[PDB]
Symmetry: C3
Subunit: 598 residues, 3 copies
């Protein structure tokens, strides 16, 4: 039977006619033509005889998936389905350009992957480096062509097989898109591994419009060998992460894992949830990555995320090379709800909402960070966590503005004494920042705002308490080593009546010509003997810098009243005019708001 | 013709060969194999003879859809398409585990539903309870297995057929995912019903990563019989609702319908639009639902939503059982634009942006709600709506912070007199909250901040007006029954010059040792006869609590000037030193800012 | 061979049997039936003989795509795939109802387009108007039926072919959905054109639930002929744009292009990135578009966007017709990070974060704009850009509230002198707005807040500097032509000690009965000769409006002290009681905070 032979052969479908819904106005097609409108891994997952091979732990599907990608690429692109209901194992490295990146699969432009099933790494990869999907087409990224219009999506899973790193110097990634333009990962679960990154977008600023959306990243650090982990590394502009879920359960992740890094301009991290990580996001301009999009990381957004972390939520940085200086500016951090998870004090990296960090080599004098707006966020750390701050300011800062946040942690501004001595400019802490009381009574020997810096200039710190904490040493303290100029420092009187110290200037810095300061203090006064209007003067002479002061105490006397307001004198005394109904020298102790130029 | 018989039989496609795009490197497949890569309801919507049955109002498609789900489940999962261009009717209950939930269809793990057509409930369900899709596999949820990786998506519709409830005690749901992990509904329109919920995620904290995105919910309450409605009920952590649309047209919905409830930690409600509902979202930790994820609802986000409602936007709550206490903390409500739709005063539940509500049995002394941040929202209620407040504070509150909102409604803080007497702690109303003027001139006999509580502690109320309203009785009023301690209460002077009362303390609570207060008042003063510096004293003796006061009035005199500032005396008089150019007893009425410890 | 003939004919697939995965419980189907579950352009892209035609620059695919849409529509809807790996060219106009709109393709209800390949306009369209996809079904939109449930999505591209406009009066659009309900565009790249709009949603308020998500719009303006461009025009309620990318490279776009317009209630623009445009979004209620959804545009959201623009970020407007008055209210602008790109001063439309604009004919006295909340945004303009303002207030304003923003540009509030004279009501500029220092030293002859208005009422301007700028003429200036009443104007003293002018009232408006003002000034005082308590009086008589004043200077004297606080006298002098330790007339120059009713 000749016709039988033709129909049963691989060309059979090309001899069965078809017309859509019997529409005589439709194209006269062959069944093969219609089936050709889709493509799956099954169309390439065959032995050399063309007989299909079933996937499984005993089968390496790499070559077949590569063949599919290669073939679809040469036809101008399309979408390859990785079928649901099966697990497809990868058990060897790819070859060519991706070899230099320990690549398994090479992605190609215009070839999308619809992962509905599961992709799983075989034991071959135990203790070895790997990059599962690689978009570079040359071992030297600088010589690589671009990856364009490559989208990975579906309800499927990329499982890294649980293998630990073999050595800390190794690198592992899920999707390394390369010099990627209009590439994305959507809907995929990345799980069960010990990797450096799950997804990297771009290369040294080369790339654009790359996005990670609605993905899950689960348990991607599992050993002490893993040197560092950032789940999504965004290294091209006009790119970002949205509506993802990141979770770690390993102890090690709490010390080394960060959910996202934003390294280029016009990048974002929004609407995501993080649990079990050390850090939320690094927002940094590394000068070594400035080739593709310039040396300025601007228009950076971290918004509307939810996190439980053990270290720092947002870490800001910038650094230089011999010929390039990195700059970070125009950043917004807003609408995030973040808490330091339960842990012993000092058992993980210092808890912080914002960290101004030193560069990779520890340099704290190379940063150019400014025009950062931190607003409308909530931060919480349990009362026992001494190492928790709204901002750990450890390197030079050229500007950061805090407005309308709620910070409930040990410190508001902090830098460790005897460590770095940052130069701080344009730090603005608005009075609308609400300071929570979880750490009330835990602050013996501590300063709420601990200004351990070389210098502070053009800065504003408006301290507003909302409950008492009589355990703290001071609300704000400037060591003698910290220069302060052209700045405004105020401590609102509410909840401070019983505090011994409110603002402390160990170098008498509040006397600066362009320092604007106000804070409460207790002052002893005596008067002359005169009946009628009579001056009261301070006993002490430590007020030569005071422009005015006013009473914060009642006067429990009938026969006299001290002045409501005071100026100073050349010798450093305060002086005001009170009233003696009857004559006599008076002596009183009063709580005063001391003011300088405000 | 033997070959003809084989080809025309159901095994025919298994005898037609195919090779993708004639690629000799591709798998030699049978047409049947390629068609097997997809599956639709048509593959199971047949009579016992295997002859296809057309769907319609006269056909019950339930058994066929169940057969499809069951079959795909046993093959490890996949996606079943519910074809476009047809309406598929359901007209009977399912059986087994879902029977205890009035279930129609039982969902199974890894089996997704791509609903492109319409699913419609037949009259069989009129006046009866139903749950359209159920993920539980046992009548007892505590004994049920988990539903994993189940996604419902598409451009289709679930139509509840418009049937009213038969009785208020009945329950109705669209998708009850059960103990659901990685389940979602995306893109679907749920419409035309009288239901309790459209979608429930999780069960008593069991579940994770469940999401409702880009769905529409239209007219899901239509009768007086419906007891309660919440469109999406989120009862598992790490789950949420994003970019949905909720609309009701029925009068009944304005009294009973809420768009979302968030019941577990790390849940969110963002970027959605609501119209015609009573309420926006309940954000509550019910102790009875604490089994799967603990008794703390933390990291709760309500952000960037748009709403027109008739009752309350966000309702906060927590309650206890005999052995479990619920806690709600670490909540952020921000970026929402909300208005109370046009309605007569008192014709719907009391209008509010935030409501601190009593539990289901009316208890107002069981709540543990704190660390709530409400910032950057806009709220509006038409001028006639007496029952409108920024916050209705009706049950115990342990903390809530308001910063940088615009509230344009009748009351800022309100609790009805003669009802509950909440214990309020850590209520912070920052001065940056802008109080709109829509209700100006409508406040006869009313207090803008009506502090009808048992006690207020560690709280801040900084009242800042932005226009005049001389109709109000006071800006803030504390009844004698309200204890006040360790708190800051201030009324800015702007727009208050002509107000008879600014802050009113009916129990003289402003005299508290740790109360920090300032507000304007008019005070009559007289002076002694002395030429030169001369004291002025208040006629009245109601100022024993005042630490200082200063003039808010000009002095229209040449021959004397009253003091700019004043202290007090033991008898409760104010006293200051003014100046008589010429002697004579003086008498003046002055507007003063009265201050205590500020 | 009869059977061969049947199988090879277009009816062949209808004679090959199939049963899903050989399941005897599945439907006995024909291969044709299964293939009929999907449909693509290939099923209609054939010559009259039914022989397929390959697409290309030489082939007009319009008629074939229209045939596909028409056919699928008549079957109750479905999704037509536009295949990947091919470019489909359109080279002629459609006919019928869409002819009046220069339409190419007519969309139909329930017919979705999955664009995976590329759609490209042929040279036929060079210099001509066109609307690529049109949802109207009648040349007269008022007589058109509705377009419902039409979704365009995929990884594909709509390329406008780079053709310039032939004339400025022409119009061009990508997708004009018409009276559109539940329509959307998702994932598509629109590129390479000179168009008026890329996408229009709704028609004069008719429509609902239309969304543009995850789309890219690249280089859609390229000539001087193009009169105006707005990429997405939202003209139906309950609709919006989310997570899109907009980029222009042409010089012309910097002068005429806007990314989005929001024209109806309950609309939004969120999470998008814009580069190279003149403007971000117009948020306007045009009375001429009030038919479908009323004359009020309320619940308008512009949130969490990132932009580099050359003109104005958000432009607010409303206008009237003979019988309809437009109103704009209940708007929120928050979480946006925006910068004016590098450009010469005055080389593009005046840089602004918010612009209150005149109507299309230049009218500035027809607007009804109120209840606008601008919070938590960051705005930056390089130092050379004189024409940069937080708000350019050029038309009547009934309310706008600014809280917790960071504005780093030349002006905070600005209107050009000698142009319009707006009536301003309910403008609130909270003290929590942080004023950046990029323009410090560039403000010679300029007023930071330049209040060039006819009148200001019920407004608040709380100026808070965060660094010095001694170049500016004043912090705030009211010309004599600007009435001011029932308003609060304050200038915080920090960074102002060396300023010659702080607040300037050229018409002495600070003396108003209901004006609440405070600002620093230098005042010369002399005293009487009296030993002991002694009055000091100002030499000048310009303080008849001052209610109190206090010292902002130290007293570098031992023998006397001036008063800490002052009142006034009828003749306009300040007066206070100081102290002469030793007698003698004293003369001092002091910096004072002058206060009126605050
Ligand atoms: Cl200084
Ligand atoms: Cl107290
Ligand atoms: Cl006035």
């Amino acid at each position: 039977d000749q016709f039988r032979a033709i129909i049963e052969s691989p060309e059979g479908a090309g001899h069965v006619g078809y017309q859509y819904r019997r529409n005589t106005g439709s194209t006269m097609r062959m069944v093969s033509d219609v089936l050709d409108e889709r493509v799956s891994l099954w169309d390439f997952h065959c032995d050399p005889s063309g007989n299909v091979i079933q996937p499984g732990p005993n089968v390496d599907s790499r070559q077949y998936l590569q063949a599919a990608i290669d073939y679809v690429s040469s036809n101008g692109g399309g979408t390859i389905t990785i079928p649901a209901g099966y697990t497809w194992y990868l058990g060897s490295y790819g070859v060519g350009g991706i070899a230099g990146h320990s690549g398994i699969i090479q992605l190609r432009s215009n070839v999308n992957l619809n992962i509905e099933g599961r992709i799983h790494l075989s034991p071959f990869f135990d203790l070895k480096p790997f990059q599962v999907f690689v978009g570079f087409d040359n071992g030297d990224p600088a010589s690589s062509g671009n990856l364009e219009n490559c989208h990975i999506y579906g309800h499927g899973v990329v499982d890294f097989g649980g293998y630990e790193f073999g050595a800390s110097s190794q690198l592992r990634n899920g999707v390394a898109f390369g010099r990627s333009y209009n590439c994305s990962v959507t809907g995929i679960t990345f799980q069960n591994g010990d990797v450096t990154w799950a997804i990297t977008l771009g290369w040294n600023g080369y790339g654009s419009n790359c996005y990670v959306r609605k993905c899950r990243f689960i348990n991607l650090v599992n050993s002490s060998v893993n040197a560092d982990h950032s789940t999504v590394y965004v290294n091209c502009p006009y790119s970002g992460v949205e509506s993802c879920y990141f979770s770690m359960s390993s102890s090690f992740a709490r010390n080394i894992a960060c959910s996202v890094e934003l390294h280029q301009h016009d990048t974002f991290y929004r609407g995501s949830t993080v649990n079990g990580y050390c850090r939320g996001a690094y927002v940094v301009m590394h000068a070594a990555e400035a080739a593709g999009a310039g040396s300025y990381a601007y228009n950076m957004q971290v918004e509307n995320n939810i996190a439980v972390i053990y270290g720092q939520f947002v870490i800001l940085g910038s650094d230089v090379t011999a010929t390039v200086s990195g700059h970070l500016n125009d950043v917004i951090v807003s609408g995030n709800i973040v808490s330091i998870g339960e842990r012993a004090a000092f058992s993980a990296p210092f808890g912080a909402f914002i960290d101004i960090g030193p560069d990779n080599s520890g340099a704290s004098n190379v940063q150019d960070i400014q025009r950062v707006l931190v607003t409308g966020n909530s931060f919480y750390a349990p009362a026992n966590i001494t190492d928790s701050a709204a901002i750990t300011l450890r390197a030079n800062l050229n500007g950061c503005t805090f407005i309308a946040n709620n910070f409930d942690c040990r410190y508001m501004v902090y830098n460790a004494p005897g460590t770095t001595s940052p130069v701080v400019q344009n730090l603005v802490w608005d009075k609308s920042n609400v300071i929570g009381g979880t750490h009330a009574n835990q602050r013996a020997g501590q300063n709420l705002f601990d200004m351990q810096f070389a210098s502070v200039v053009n800065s504003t710190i408006e301290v507003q308490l909302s409950c008492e904490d009589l355990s703290m040493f001071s609300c704000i303290l400037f060591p003698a080593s910290c220069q302060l100029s052209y700045s405004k420092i105020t401590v609102d009187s509410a909840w401070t009546k019983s505090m011994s110290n409110t603002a402390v200037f160990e170098g008498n810095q509040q006397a600066g010509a362009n320092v604007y300061v106000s804070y409460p203090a207790t002052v002893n006064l005596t008067s002359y003997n005169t009946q009628g209007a009579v001056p009261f003067f301070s006993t002490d002479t430590n007020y030569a810098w005071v422009t005015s002061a006013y009473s914060l105490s009642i006067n429990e006397n009938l026969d006299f009243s001290p002045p409501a307001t005071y100026t100073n004198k050349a010798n450093g005394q305060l002086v005001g005019v009170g009233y003696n109904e009857i004559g006599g020298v008076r002596s009183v102790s009063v709580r005063l708001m001391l003011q300088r130029q405000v």
